[PDB]
Subunit: 160 residues, 4 copies
Amino acid sequence: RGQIQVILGPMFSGKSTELMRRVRRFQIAQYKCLVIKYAKDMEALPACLLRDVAQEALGVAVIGIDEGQFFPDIVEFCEAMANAGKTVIVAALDGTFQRKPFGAILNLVPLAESVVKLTAVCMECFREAAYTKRLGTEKEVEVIGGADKYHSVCRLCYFK
Amino acid sequence: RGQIQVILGPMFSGKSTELMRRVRRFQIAQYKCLVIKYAKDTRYMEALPACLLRDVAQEALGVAVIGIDEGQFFPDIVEFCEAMANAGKTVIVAALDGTFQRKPFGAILNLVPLAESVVKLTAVCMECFREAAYTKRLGTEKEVEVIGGADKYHSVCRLCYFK
Amino acid sequence: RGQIQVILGPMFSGKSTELMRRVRRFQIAQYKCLVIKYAKDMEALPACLLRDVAQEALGVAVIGIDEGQFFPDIVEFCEAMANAGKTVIVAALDGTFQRKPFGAILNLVPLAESVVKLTAVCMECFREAAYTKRLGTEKEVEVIGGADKYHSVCRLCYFK
Amino acid sequence: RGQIQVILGPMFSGKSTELMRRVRRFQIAQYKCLVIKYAKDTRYMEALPACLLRDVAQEALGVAVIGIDEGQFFPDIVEFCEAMANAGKTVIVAALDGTFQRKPFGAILNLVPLAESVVKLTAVCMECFREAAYTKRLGTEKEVEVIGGADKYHSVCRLCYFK
Ligand SMILES: [Zn+2]
Ligand SMILES: [Zn+2]
Ligand SMILES: [Zn+2]
Ligand SMILES: [Zn+2]
């Protein structure tokens, strides 16, 4: 019996660290694990499309995807793997800097056995944060960056 | 300061109870609460029925804490929740995440990017007795909205869903 | 395979409501449930000692105990039931009005498969609350009461 | 305002990772953090070894956020955490809840009544592959403290624990 777990949150909330905590519990217990990272940001492979790691993923028990929002192919990938009998764990930002859905990641929710959304700390007033604020003027969805270009932010701070 | 909490789950997972437990905590500490139910689901603190949350906007505006039950049925929910939360209110939404076909139910998933907290609850599988994440329709009707209970639907794991 | 789940929290945090949410999921799925309430505050029975409901508990699949802190007998009761193959779910206050362990309830933690501690809302400043404050001067552990005698309180408020 | 978060679990459940994820959130937002490890467990942001948390009291006093790893080994933990939390600090404690015999480990359970949050984590059973809630000692030593890893211990469910 396979499954899909989803780990949502803004930036700076530790989504990857949670994905890995989870994946490692299976590894220290001698399951074959694979962990897939977005090329542009136990086996561990960088990728831009999940097709590039599908045949490899078929040969393991536990799959982790970091930054799932960047993988247009993610919903079909996960559903097939889980139906293949694999444990699939996905870290993905829930929203863009506009607080809109980020890629195809939320269509994973109806298919997932578990869903959680983690918390950051507001970089502007130090309450809990659920959103990511883009600090500059660019308006395209994909702008790779860290605390240089982005602030994890609460609702008040978001709208300042 | 205002916020949106979201409670997802299959049918039979207690989303309404969890919604009432949260709202009641604020009420016993003397907040004004309002719970909104969907008018057309009658299979059984201000409590009010609604068909479009616009119906109850002025009543909502006069309270601290607002619960929305069966939130998948309100096509205006994003706009309503976001506006209330922005005015200072705590908003808590119980809602099914997927239809009988396991596809987004209504507009409810657009609330995720706007929400401070999101949980997904667990039912127990009515066919094998593992944990259940999905709802299966027993009959053959194909329209999305069919009000009903265990008569019409089973809470179901991945395995049983596809049997 | 049986288990023990523990639901801790201060007063006014909905522990009973959570216990029942959990128990009801099993009932609507046609398991025999029993729910045991403290006599002094689906089958539902009031009790002062769990020995009075043990033989009955043997005949069901899912057992709930509300106010487990009041049952001196609780640890042995739960462990035996769970080892009998039953799902045992326990709501219990974690601490007294002095923030000390309340009865034998924390010896359930090492034996429990799951443990959570819920939150109330501070009745004095309206932040989250983890503690119960006794409003009057009595110093005995057991004083049955509601928001008449007690306030759910945060750490600051506790120490005012 | 100060607080005590507690992370329990069997061995192999990631309590340390969860501890670091929480602490790192405060650090990336420019808080001063301190992580304390138990000196005698060397089987591999201020990080410091300790045997009694009194050792590191003055270093602790100069930071916003303090993590305590393997907290079951510090016989002074209640007093330390409660004092720091009362002085304004956020304190987060990873610790095992039970010994190899499933009895309270150290003083750690007395922290529960003082804590704002308590979670118990899950390992995976090393013998049947269900979820694991307990730790079993493979050998026959009977003293409580025996530093070691998968060599000496298995993370285990109720069923396998008693096999
Ligand atoms: Zn802020
Ligand atoms: Zn099933
Ligand atoms: Zn307070
Ligand atoms: Zn096992």
